């Protein structure tokens, strides 16, 4: 229905605004664009599903996310990729991991304060009906 397409358009506006607020934060610079294979050639031998904030905006615009849960699966993948690729004790790995955990925790905290729980339940019930 037209009502349903209006629901999904509001979801996209909300996701673009959360993603923009993450992308301008200086702590999250190394998560804003895909890893360059001609700077880190080993990356794609270890990490089987790369993800970054520029790819997330592209996915919003392609109508890939029908719920906030499917968006948070990609924010979780950005954070889990960094914990797996940079697991060592040295300061450079520990700084990347601390920033990855902060990106994940910031996304969840914005959504807890700003997403209405009945708006998410509506999106889940439309998705299940298709």
Ligand X SMILES: C[C@H]1CN[C@](C)(C(=O)NC2CC2)CN1C(=O)NCC1CC1
Residues at the contact surface with ligand X, assessed by CB under 6 A: 30, 32-33, 35, 39-40, 82, 85-86, 96
Least distance to ligand X, CB of residue 64, Å: 21
Least distance to ligand X, CB of residue 83, Å: 11
Task: Please name which of 22, 30, 37 lies closest in space to residue 93, comparing C-alpha atoms.
Answer: 30
Q: Of how many residues is the chain composed? A: 130
Which whole-number Å values give the CA distances from 31 to 79, 94, 116, 119, in the listed order? 9, 15, 27, 28
CB 71 within 8 A of CB 65: yes
Helix locations, the chain, DSSP H:
2-23, 43-46, 53-61, 68-85, 91-114, 117-128
Least distance to ligand X, CB of residue 114, Å: 26
Least distance to ligand X, CB of residue 92, Å: 7
């Amino acid at each position: 229905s037209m009502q349903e397409e209006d629901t999904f358009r509001e979801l996209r506006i909300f996701l673009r605004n959360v993603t923009h607020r993450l992308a301008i934060d200086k702590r999250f610079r190394v998560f804003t664009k895909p890893v360059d294979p001609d700077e880190v050639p080993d990356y794609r031998t270890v990490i089987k599903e790369p993800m970054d904030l520029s790819s997330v905006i592209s996915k919003i615009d392609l109508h890939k996310y029908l719920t906030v849960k499917d968006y948070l699966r990609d924010i979780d993948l950005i954070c889990s990729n960094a914990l797996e690729y940079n697991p060592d004790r040295d300061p450079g790995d520990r700084l990347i991991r601390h920033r990855a955990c902060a990106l994940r925790d910031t996304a969840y905290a914005i959504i807890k304060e700003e997403l209405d729980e009945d708006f998410e339940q509506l999106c889940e019930e439309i998705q299940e009906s298709r």
